[PDB]
Design an enzyme around this catalytic site. Structure first.
Site, PDB file in Angstrom:
ATOM      1  CG  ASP A  82      -2.235   0.890   1.050  1.00 55.52           C
ATOM      2  OD1 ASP A  82      -2.208   1.890   0.279  1.00 55.52           O
ATOM      3  OD2 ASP A  82      -3.237   0.603   1.731  1.00 55.52           O
ATOM      4  CG  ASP A  93      -4.533   4.972  -0.134  1.00 55.35           C
ATOM      5  OD1 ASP A  93      -3.695   4.006  -0.151  1.00 55.35           O
ATOM      6  OD2 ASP A  93      -5.394   5.136   0.777  1.00 55.35           O
ATOM      7  CG  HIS A 153     -10.522   5.289   2.588  1.00 51.68           C
ATOM      8  ND1 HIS A 153      -9.691   6.371   2.431  1.00 51.68           N
ATOM      9  CD2 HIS A 153      -9.739   4.182   2.525  1.00 51.68           C
ATOM     10  CE1 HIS A 153      -8.448   5.939   2.265  1.00 51.68           C
ATOM     11  NE2 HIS A 153      -8.450   4.590   2.320  1.00 51.68           N
ATOM     12  CG  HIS A 161      -8.938   6.716   6.453  1.00 45.96           C
ATOM     13  ND1 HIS A 161      -7.671   6.835   7.006  1.00 45.96           N
ATOM     14  CD2 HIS A 161      -8.973   5.528   5.803  1.00 45.96           C
ATOM     15  CE1 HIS A 161      -6.955   5.766   6.695  1.00 45.96           C
ATOM     16  NE2 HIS A 161      -7.739   4.930   5.966  1.00 45.96           N
ATOM     17  CD  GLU A 187      -7.801   0.525   1.088  1.00 41.14           C
ATOM     18  OE1 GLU A 187      -6.798  -0.238   1.094  1.00 41.14           O
ATOM     19  OE2 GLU A 187      -7.906   1.497   1.889  1.00 41.14           O
ATOM     20  CD  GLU A 280      -5.644   2.084  -1.305  1.00 41.62           C
ATOM     21  OE1 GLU A 280      -4.394   2.198  -1.367  1.00 41.62           O
ATOM     22  OE2 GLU A 280      -6.285   2.272  -0.249  1.00 41.62           O
TER      23      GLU A 280
END
Length: 295
Positions: A82, A93, A153, A161, A187, A280
């Site tokens: 990640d 991300d 998210h 987040h 994700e 992701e």
């Protein structure tokens, strides 16, 4: 909401992601990998949005190394990388799973396919539960279980987040409508385990949230440094380790965590030690399709 920043973050995230898969060789010391990646992020003019997740198997996320960490990649390992990058607070991300020194697997495929399934489907106007369905199916119809309580998210500036999951299942009352301009990490996680995660030690990652009375001199000073270098993005225990005796460090952090100035991101384990896979991308929602920041 500077898109060119978001895009650069994405390019850099994309590069270091690819380099990270090249360096993911058996006997590669996990500490060294994370450092190599984060170094390469800063060369390309990026700062990290967070310490790089190198989560293996039953371990789902919020593993980043520490100094003294000897974890080393072992062939057959399902390694979740990640990567996060930000440009004046604008975030990319992105994540891949890799079976270290081996070919892709049908579990790895279930997750990556779930990602593509979601992205095709995403326009402004679409309710998030639709992307849920999209993911759920891909993973299930390959006879695998999606992790329910670990999702994508919404992302906002300096806010990783931003508080709307892109859940990995259909839920009748997940009714949020994707808007022109929404940024979002999709994700999917998939596992042979239960399809659910819990917290386990350690806590190797932390985030500043709120300044608070701190009676203790050591802790107040550490909170100061944390705010100055990291602000309201997550940070590794690893980064602070450099300076300051490791004992007095671990105590200060827990002392701040207690007062609720910082909050931990403890390691997440799939609850039946289910081997776990993740993919992701960051997307910017637009009218009849989506930018993919990290592709």
């Amino acid at each position: 909401m500077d898109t060119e920043k978001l895009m650069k973050a994405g390019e850099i995230a994309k590069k270091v992601r690819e380099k990270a898969i090249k360096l993911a060789r058996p006997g590669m010391l996990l500490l060294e990998l994370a450092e190599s990646i984060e170094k390469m992020i800063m060369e390309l003019g990026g700062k990290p949005a967070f310490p790089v997740g190198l989560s293996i198997n039953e371990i789902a996320a919020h593993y980043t190394p520490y100094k003294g960490d000897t974890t080393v990649l072992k062939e057959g390992d399902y390694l979740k990388i990640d990567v996060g990058v930000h440009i004046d607070g604008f975030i990319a991300d992105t994540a891949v799973t890799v079976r270290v020194g081996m070919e892709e697997d049908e579990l790895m495929e279930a997750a990556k396919e779930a990602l593509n399934a979601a992205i095709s489907v995403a326009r402004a106007g679409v309710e998030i539960k639709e992307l849920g369905k999209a993911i759920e199916n891909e993973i299930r119809k390959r006879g695998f279980k999606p992790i329910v309580n670990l999702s994508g998210h919404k992302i906002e500036r300096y806010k990783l987040h931003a508080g709307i999951s892109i859940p990995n299942i259909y839920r009748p009352h997940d009714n949020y409508v994707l808007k022109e301009g929404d940024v979002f990490a999709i994700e999917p996680f998939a596992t042979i385990g239960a399809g659910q995660v819990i917290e386990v030690p350690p806590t190797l990652i932390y985030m500043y949230v709120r300044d608070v009375p701190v009676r203790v001199a050591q802790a107040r000073f550490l909170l100061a440094k944390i705010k100055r270098e990291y602000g309201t993005l997550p940070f590794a225990y690893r980064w602070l380790q450099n300076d300051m005796p490791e004992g007095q460090l671990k105590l200060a952090l827990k002392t701040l965590e207690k007062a609720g100035a910082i909050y931990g991101y403890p390691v997440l384990k799939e609850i039946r030690n289910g081997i776990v896979a993740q993919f992701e991308h960051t997307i910017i929602v637009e009218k009849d399709s989506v930018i993919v920041t990290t592709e």
